Design a protein around this motif. Structure first.
Motif, PDB file in Angstrom:
ATOM      1  N   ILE A 127       4.459   7.771   1.508  1.00  0.00           N
ATOM      2  CA  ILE A 127       5.405   6.688   1.732  1.00  0.00           C
ATOM      3  C   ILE A 127       4.930   5.393   1.113  1.00  0.00           C
ATOM      4  O   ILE A 127       3.787   5.297   0.671  1.00  0.00           O
ATOM      5  N   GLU A 128       5.833   4.417   1.085  1.00  0.00           N
ATOM      6  CA  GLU A 128       5.555   3.094   0.564  1.00  0.00           C
ATOM      7  C   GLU A 128       5.564   2.119   1.732  1.00  0.00           C
ATOM      8  O   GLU A 128       6.466   2.138   2.577  1.00  0.00           O
ATOM      9  N   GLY A 129       4.559   1.253   1.769  1.00  0.00           N
ATOM     10  CA  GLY A 129       4.480   0.299   2.847  1.00  0.00           C
ATOM     11  C   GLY A 129       3.597  -0.904   2.575  1.00  0.00           C
ATOM     12  O   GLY A 129       3.419  -1.324   1.421  1.00  0.00           O
ATOM     13  N   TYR A 181       0.861  -1.169   0.000  1.00  0.00           N
ATOM     14  CA  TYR A 181       0.000   0.000   0.000  1.00  0.00           C
ATOM     15  C   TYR A 181       0.914   1.241   0.000  1.00  0.00           C
ATOM     16  O   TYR A 181       1.809   1.334   0.813  1.00  0.00           O
TER      17      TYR A 181
END
Ligand code: KP3
Ligand code: KP3
Ligand code: KP3
Ligand code: KP3
Ligand code: IMP
Ligand code: IMP
Ligand code: IMP
Ligand code: IMP
Ligand code: K
Ligand code: K
Ligand code: K
Ligand code: K
Lengths: 354, 354, 354, 354
Positions: free
Chosen positions: D286-288, D269
């Motif tokens: 952000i990337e997560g 996500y």
């Protein structure tokens, strides 16, 4: 609520809700010491307890063993209703034949609840608790009013739960003999997260009391209590008794076998709105465990000792005078300072675990 | 307290309580540097200390070694009373025969406390501290007034503890030579949790001072102090001295052997209302340990250095002028910003551990 | 501050202090995009920077390499003064002979500081920063006024630090060409804990600006900044530039060798009031380390990019218009919602680490 | 905002921003039970949904599988625009040929966005969402107004995002068929940290609604929702629908393969403003990863069940009546009390994870 927080309606955000950790009782002039305090208080219009505590109507807190022990300690148990009617009635009889002890029992709303109620009255129950998430629903007020009409000469009828002045007022007009306050503060409760609904428990008591006190109807503070000082705060906010689940679920007398996880001892404790208790459902409670705490009598001694200390500090010879005490509102720093801080605890205290 | 928080009584929640972490001292115009500050202050009406610090009357903080070291550092120790009367009296004599150093001693309330007090006066004590959880109880005010009547020509009589203006006023009228403030803020204290009673310590000082200052009676700020800046805050709120337990319990001079747990060094520190100190009881303190901190003299140097810095920042040449300084109230973000933040500490500082 | 918090003096607790995490900038009508924003701003009355950033005068942040890189990036470095006068002067010359770049240098207060200052002016420094913990001390105002008198035609003279309106006003009257704001908010600073003194940094800027803006004197916001958004907040509160230590200490150009602890890379970062920098002392800073962050140019690009984004959001074509933006005050829930939340970060962002 | 926080301008800090965790809905008199509640609500002026939920236009949340499932569940998906125009258009056709389901699609601002929009309209899209970080920029209002002019007879045009009353008013005057609220509250969003800009989401809704409600334009509450109760709060603040990213990204229908890290299951996500999505850039996301949550249908059942519970508690038969409910503002203690507390959860609940 004075401060601007958005929009053009000053009543949209209607007040600031406080709960136990937001307030302290102010000490006052006193000729009371813990030994001389009188902790008796009204459970209902007709029923006075020696100790102002009642156990939650939950299947991991109160069956007959708990009800018997609470009555002998000067309080009362409310028998849960997650079991067949004949079995709940039988447990009422078990308590009644252990010395004519006081006992209460929960019922719901509807035809099956009504049959349950009549059986409980026949078994000799002293208090019926109409046990619901939202007593300001019209169906609940109807249940309370009809029970009081039909059997109100034989039995006291408690209604709940509420979190507002108007809801407490509706239960009083419906004929409630006491009003139980608490929407969402329970340790195992998720209603406030799942539905987004409730009111912080000190404010909820202050508001309900503003309706109930002038009508002479006792308020039962239900849920959210974790320390003996919380009981003193709830009563000073105007409640007459406090209902406890979490604090009693770990005791020997609560239903459940001891759980032995990783060197330690626990007992299961779960919301009555959890999937496990109700057995797709949308639950409003969780399933979990609490530390084992030993005999009920020793827990109640610690709780009443802390309440007696509060009465001595506030100069309150009776619960009725404690209900007149004053609070100071505190900040997060105040709360950290209230607990032990900056020390490593090396020994367990009987009335404090971090 | 203006904001609506429940019910119809605006005085039910009577004010907002602040403690040390809620406030900062505002810098002001200054012709003072830490070197030129004068830290002397009144302990009591008749007794002025060079350094406005006194050690707690606790059996893990002050026996004669601590009392001697505190006096030599320009402050004072109050000898604890959890020991036979002849032994407490003997310790008073040990201090008195080490240079005529100032010393105080705690007593309780009652016949045995009265015998203890007379023996202490005979041993040459300078200050009697009537050492109680709730000085607004009538029995305590009686003890203070009778001591002042009988021996008040020979000895100064301190009364405590209080957390309100009215309680401070009652002690002043009882004849107290100083008033000790602090109900519940102690690091090892659980009174606020167990009884639910107290007031955040900055507000408690501001209120007590409003009673004591106009009567010329010094206030001792007792409990809750953890950093040298806290001492400056307590004095700026109007206290004349600060009493310390936790900050001194770890020193070489405090009673206790060094504990060596897992590569580190500690000393035991416990509430006088803990089960361990009192030896079913309902305790109002816990038992624990604090890091070992080395010689008392070095701790006091760090504490007084931080106080002197505060005096330079606020332009205060004397403690009497520091008592006129102003605060700003801060948020949780303000508090995080006040401490070191966003850095990994690699070296210990002598006046800061996280 | 309206709410009752103790005592009878409404000015004792004089206001509510906010810092960066307490506020957000409100978006506004905009014909600005990050690309078209103009980030130039006054460092002092006479000196305008292309990028409103200056590096802290610390021995783990700014020597000549940092000063050169900051100037080339459109900002400025202030050379620290924890080194012999001839060496600080030599570093000024190193910067001056790398293209006539702007450079500043810190000095203290006194005879040795005065000799240092004259040497720095001789070396060609553009800005002298009178670098002190408390500029409202009379000795500091004297230093500022005398420098401005003697060399103020050749050099700009900055004075700090302050945290109040009255202190900023005193520096303006002393002749300061800019006023540096920040008492205690530094990441490595313990002044607020050790002395108990300071003011939260947003409020400190708003107050200093109320004195400096009407006199046409720029304010430098010094300390407490951790994210590019903090720079936008400080400028919107009315500062003209921001001084950074922590955010730059990890860069290749900051003094210090790379530390390789447990698979990761760090650089030392320490307060100038720490024991280590000063070498019993009573320190007002700590010693530590920050993550290594790579080339200065890339950090400054990220910081200016975040500032440009803020200018686009607030419709600010210039820093002068950004200084007119509005805040909303937020709660702890607001702050949690502002950061990423409820997600596990799997990739590093160049402008965000949790 | 009444309280003094610095400077001489009372409008500098213009109000106190609240978000979801700051408020609870007050229970009210009710003849509604969850079963009888009607959850339908306006997505736009012309489009009513059966369930007031729409999936975020993100490349880890909504492609055609998600759009189809959301429509069948009674809500809608907004197809993301991080892909070629022919492919986004093709996905619109995939949804349209699965039963004539409703579908929306995101577009940006400019010539390429305009071509994208025309292709989407040709493919049969029902809703165009002008998908921007700051809709109060003049370029965005132009895009909204021109789309409504050119194709507004064939398609509904949504504009966002905003966080203020004035920005919502500008979109209404530009001709928006709905207004999307949310600057910074997204779980993967860093805008509030990186730019320092935004407004807490409850206040942002209350303000936007004050502009949109009187003009009959629905508000979409976008970002920051984590529990079913949050949906009830957003609607009670006056939104008509809620947009969800995080809560849906973990479902089977969201784009992404299952990630199996250390015995557990996750899905990626990421913010659309993250480096990864945009591929030196200055990212605002952000990337997560989030936990895998199973079929979309089961998540939506839990969310709607929690909303229905809220409607029963507040006595709201329809979303239009829910929009008239009242809040109480709560403290950090209130929030801790709202969640389960002081219990160890032993079983997962389908609508609650800590
Ligand atoms: C004495 O140590 C403290 C101190 C200084 C403080 C606390 C505390 O819990 C303790 C621990 C409590 C005890 C060790 C028990 N204790 C003994 C005494 C000696 O004085 C006893 C007299 O103090 C009065 N008193 C003491 N506690 C109460 C009470 N809860 N209610 C009413 N009166 C009380 C009462 O007149 C009684 O005769 N006070 N507390 C505290 O919360 O703030 C200050
Ligand atoms: C200088 O570095 C800082 C800075 C910039 C700040 C702080 C700080 O603790 C420090 C560390 C403190 C030191 C390194 C010690 N130091 C040296 C100087 C140089 O100027 C000394 C002069 O500054 C004045 N001064 C400096 N500190 C005080 C004080 N506590 N009380 C009264 N006056 C003080 C006084 O006139 C003195 O002659 N200022 N602090 C801080 O809290 O906010 C800003
Ligand atoms: C689009 O995704 C979001 C959304 C929906 C939100 C945020 C966000 O950071 C992002 C990520 C940001 C991007 C992916 C970058 N981006 C692309 C667009 C598409 O529209 C671009 C137009 O939107 C306007 N715009 C977009 N950002 C700005 C800004 N910082 N300053 C001034 N104007 C701005 C400007 O007119 C520009 O032409 N908007 N942000 C946010 O913080 O709240 C909502
Ligand atoms: C009963 O246990 C509680 C209690 C005491 C509380 C809560 C709770 O979630 C629960 C768990 C909820 C359940 C076990 C489900 N349940 C069963 C009943 C028995 O009474 C049912 C009647 O109570 C009314 N009612 C119960 N819930 C609602 C609702 N969400 N909306 C409207 N009306 C509702 C309605 O008239 C219905 O016929 N109430 N909740 C709570 O949040 O605060 C107190
Ligand atoms: O599943 C449930 N959801 C919400 N509240 C519950 C549930 N089951 C019991 N309760 C309430 O929670 C109270 C106990 O709270 P505790 O003392 O904080 O653990 C009970 O007396 C009920 O009022
Ligand atoms: O057991 C106790 N319960 C509560 N307070 C105590 C107890 N024992 C000592 N105190 C108080 O706590 C103070 C020390 O607080 P500290 O400096 O924060 O550790 C003492 O000076 C007493 O006023
Ligand atoms: O030891 C110290 N104690 C307090 N503040 C310091 C010390 N050394 C530097 N400072 C201040 O902290 C600022 C850097 O703060 P930072 O950007 O938050 O790390 C410097 O520019 C100085 O104003
Ligand atoms: O990278 C980004 N930065 C900021 N916000 C974003 C970004 N990508 C998506 N969003 C917003 O975040 C919302 C989802 O928030 P969530 O439901 O809290 O995860 C989306 O509907 C967008 O409004
Ligand atoms: K405490
Ligand atoms: K700091
Ligand atoms: K966010
Ligand atoms: K709860």
């Amino acid at each position: 609520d004075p401060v601007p927080t958005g929009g053009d309606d000053p009543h949209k955000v209607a007040m600031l809700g406080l709960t136990f950790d937001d307030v302290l009782l102010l000490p006052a002039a006193s000729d009371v010491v813990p030994a001389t305090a009188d902790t008796s208080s009204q459970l209902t219009k007709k029923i006075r307890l020696k100790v102002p505590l009642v156990s939650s109507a939950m299947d991991t807190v109160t069956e007959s063993r708990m009800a018997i022990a609470m009555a002998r300690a000067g309080g009362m148990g409310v028998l849960h209703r997650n079991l067949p009617v004949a079995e709940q009635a039988g447990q009422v009889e078990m308590v009644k034949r252990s010395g004519g002890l006081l006992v209460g029992a929960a019922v719901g709303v509807g035809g099956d609840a009504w049959v349950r109620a009549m059986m409980l009255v026949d078994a000799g129950v002293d208090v019926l608790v109409v046990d619901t998430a939202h007593a300001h629903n019209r169906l609940v007020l109807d249940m309370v009013g009809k029970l009081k009409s039909e059997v109100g000469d034989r039995v006291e009828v408690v209604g709940g739960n509420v979190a507002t002045r108007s809801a407490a007022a509706a239960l009083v007009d419906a004929g409630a003999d006491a009003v139980k306050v608490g929407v969402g503060p329970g340790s195992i409760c998720t209603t406030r997260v799942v539905a987004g609904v409730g009111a912080p428990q000190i404010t909820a008591i202050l508001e309900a009391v503003a309706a109930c006190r002038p009508a002479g109807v006792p308020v039962i503070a239900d849920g959210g209590l974790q320390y003996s000082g919380d009981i003193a705060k709830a009563l000073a906010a105007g409640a007459s008794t406090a209902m406890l689940g979490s604090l009693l679920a770990g005791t020997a007398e609560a239903p459940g076998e001891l759980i032995f996880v990783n060197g330690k001892q626990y007992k299961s404790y779960r919301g009555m709105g959890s999937l496990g208790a109700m057995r797709k459902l949308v639950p409003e409670g969780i399933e979990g465990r609490v530390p084992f705490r030993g005999p009920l009598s020793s827990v109640i001694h610690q709780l009443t000792g802390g309440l007696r200390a509060a009465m001595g500090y506030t100069g309150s010879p009776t619960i009725e005078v404690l209900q007149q005490a004053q609070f100071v509102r505190i900040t997060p720093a105040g709360l950290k300072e209230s607990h032990p801080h900056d020390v490593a605890m090396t020994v367990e205290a009987p009335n404090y675990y971090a």
